[PDB]
Amino acid sequence: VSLISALVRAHVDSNPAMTSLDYSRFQANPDDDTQHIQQFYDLLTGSMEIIRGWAEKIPGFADLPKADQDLLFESAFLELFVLRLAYRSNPVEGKLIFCNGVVLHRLQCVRGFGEWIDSIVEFSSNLQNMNIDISAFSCIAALAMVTERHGLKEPKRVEELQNKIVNCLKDHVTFNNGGLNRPNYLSKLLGKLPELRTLCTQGLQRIFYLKLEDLVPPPAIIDKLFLDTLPF
């Protein structure tokens, strides 16, 4: 199996299928609930598990020390939640498609996600305007996780894996352009990664707000990851 094939499989097998989406909760025009907050947390915790399975399907990832795996996964989690949500969704219709296949309107997400959902949809729109095929996306997603972080036990190995993925992506882009390079396109593509950082911080801000509001406290796994991430 080629590396890009393995990256595509990791992506496809960790995303809901277009042929089995769940519309049973969707409302194009719905009518503060503790319910919306709870669901917001459920969507984050359900997504953690699926992204963890995705990460374990990236060749080389399971070869890293357990601490390195945890560091990479935990540091990238919210970025990945946003990236994959934005790729899967239908921003023009205001349709968010979560990793379990549940389709919800933007207006349904507003009570749980606050403003952050609006930032997500905007980024989705910008991302989809770039016409990133499945193979290129699979590489980009991997690169949001397989990246330099401070305090890795095997940073050279992470860097080699990063470089292998970058080279897949490069060859893929060039091949799909009939053998000519697209170095500016590749730049714009990799430029989507720094933009995920802002979206991550906005997700942290939402959890911060909900924790302070204290109507529904975050569940232990979110609380722990949230608190451990804080510089204070």
**Residues binding ligand RPG (CB under 6 A):** 74-75, 77-79, 197, 200-201, 204, 207, 222, 225-226, 229, 231
Region binding Cl ion by CB under 5 A among candidate stretches 31-39, 95-103, 106-114, 202-210: 95-103
Return the number of the residue (55 or 168) whose C-beta is nearest ligand RPG.
55
SS3 of the chain: the string is CCHHHHHHHHHHCCCCCHHHCECCCCCCCCCCCHHHHHHHHHHHHHHHHHHHHHHHCCCCHHHCCHHHHHHHHHHHHHHHHHHHHHHHCEHHHCEEECCCCEEEEHHHHHHHHCCHHHHHHHHHHHHHCCCCCHHHHHHHHHHHHCCCCCCCCCHHHHHHHHHHHHHHHHHHHHHHCCCCCCHHHHHHHHCHHHHHHHHHHHHHHHHHHHHHHCCCCCCHHHHHHHHHHCCC
How many residues of this chain interact with Cl ion, rule: CB under 5 A?
A: 3
CB of 48 to ligand RPG, least distance (A): 8
Q: Is 105 in the site for Cl ion (CB under 5 A)?
A: no
CB of 4 to ligand RPG, least distance (A): 26
CB of 109 to ligand RPG, least distance (A): 17
Among ligand RPG, Cl ion, none, what binds residue 26 when CB lies within 5 to 8 Å by partner kind? none
Region binding Cl ion by CB under 5 A among candidate stretches 42-50, 89-97, 112-120, 128-136: 42-50
Q: Is 88 in the site for Cl ion (CB under 5 A)?
A: no
CA atoms in the 13 A half-sphere facing the CB of 81: 26
Question: Could you give the CA distance from residue 165 to residue 159 in angstroms, rounded to a whole number?
Answer: 10
Among Cl ion, ligand RPG, none, what binds residue 86 when CB lies within 5 to 8 Å by partner kind? none
Considering only 47, 108, 119, 124, the residue that binds Cl ion (CB under 5 A) is 47
Among Cl ion, ligand RPG, none, what binds residue 68 when CB lies within 5 to 8 Å by partner kind? none
Return the number of the residue (173 or 202) whose C-beta is nearest Cl ion.
202
Q: Is 89 in the site for Cl ion (CB under 5 A)?
A: no
Among ligand RPG, Cl ion, none, what binds residue 116 when CB lies within 5 to 8 Å by partner kind? none
Count of H-run helices and E-run strands, the chain:
10, 2
Positions touching Cl ion (CB under 5 A) are: 47, 84, 99
